[PDB]
Amino acid sequence: SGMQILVKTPRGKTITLEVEPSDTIENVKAKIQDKEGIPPDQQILFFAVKRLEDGRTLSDYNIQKKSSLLLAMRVPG
Amino acid sequence: DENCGICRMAFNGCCPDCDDCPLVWGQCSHCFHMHCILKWLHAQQVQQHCPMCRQEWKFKE
Ligand SMILES: [Zn+2]
Ligand SMILES: [Zn+2]
Ligand SMILES: [Zn+2]
């Protein structure tokens, strides 16, 4: 069932995303691209001190309602 | 030198909060404990930048 998470973005603003626990990290980056315009391959996501891996789900990290993620940019290439 | 610019502790050891304490690099070629720079980035209310050189932050790798 759906939930909101919070994402702190590189420009300094916190945005929200509508997600599902079964959503993949790739799915989440796609949503972030829609909102922030950052290409998924230039996105790095962290939950606490965990870097989130493509192929994994939000539930795999026990990311929950109103959990907060940090979004940073990766150098292209 | 051989110390994390944020916590001023050696790269080959843990950050003050630490255990796996990996190192990361900015495009500006400054190195930090991952935990240190994450703590800094999280606190920033403006565009993410290096604590040392104030260049725009991007993780190299
Ligand atoms: Zn450090
Ligand atoms: Zn550490
Ligand atoms: Zn720097």
Swiss-Prot record, chain A:
Subcellular localization(s) per the UniProt record: Cytoplasm; Nucleus; Mitochondrion outer membrane
Cross-link (Glycyl lysine isopeptide (Gly-Lys) (interchain with K-? in acceptor proteins)): G2
Effect of G2A: Loss of ADP-ribosylation
Membrane topology type: Peripheral membrane protein
Post-translational modification (record): Phosphorylated ubiquitin specifically binds and activates parkin (PRKN), triggering mitophagy. Phosphorylation does not affect E1-mediated E2 charging of ubiquitin but affects discharging of E2 enzymes to form polyubiquitin chains. It also affects deubiquitination by deubiquitinase enzymes such as USP30. Mono-ADP-ribosylated at the C-terminus by PARP9, a component of the PPAR9-DTX3L complex. ADP-ribosylation requires processing by E1 and E2 enzymes and prevents ubiquitin conjugation to substrates such as histones.
Domain Ubiquitin-like intervals: 3-67
ADP-ribosylglycine found at: G2
Annotated function: Exists either covalently attached to another protein, or free (unanchored). When covalently bound, it is conjugated to target proteins via an isopeptide bond either as a monomer (monoubiquitin), a polymer linked via different Lys residues of the ubiquitin (polyubiquitin chains) or a linear polymer linked via the initiator Met of the ubiquitin (linear polyubiquitin chains).
Name of this protein: Ubiquitin
Organism per entry: Homo sapiens
Portion of the full sequence shown: 76 to 141 of 229
Swiss-Prot record, chain B:
Protein family per UniProt: Belongs to the RING-box family.
Gene that this sequence comes from: ANAPC11
Effect of substituting C50S: Greatly reduces autoubiquitination activity; in isoform 1
Record protein name field: Anaphase-promoting complex subunit 11
One example of a Gene Ontology biological process annotation: protein branched polyubiquitination
Domain notes: The RING-type zinc finger domain coordinates an additional third zinc ion.
Keywords: Cell cycle, Cell division, Cytoplasm, Metal-binding, Mitosis, Nucleus, Ubl conjugation, Ubl conjugation pathway, Zinc, Zinc-finger
Pathway given in the UniProt record: Protein modification; protein ubiquitination
Gene Ontology cellular component list: anaphase-promoting complex; cytosol; nucleolus; nucleoplasm; nucleus
PTM remark: Auto-ubiquitinated.
Species per Swiss-Prot/TrEMBL record: Homo sapiens
UniProt-annotated location(s): Cytoplasm; Nucleus
Distribution of this protein across tissues and organs: Expressed at high levels in skeletal muscle and heart; in moderate levels in brain, kidney, and liver; and at low levels in colon, thymus, spleen, small intestine, placenta, lung and peripheral blood leukocyte.
Zinc finger (RING-type): 15-54
Reported impact of C53S: Greatly reduces autoubiquitination activity; in isoform 1
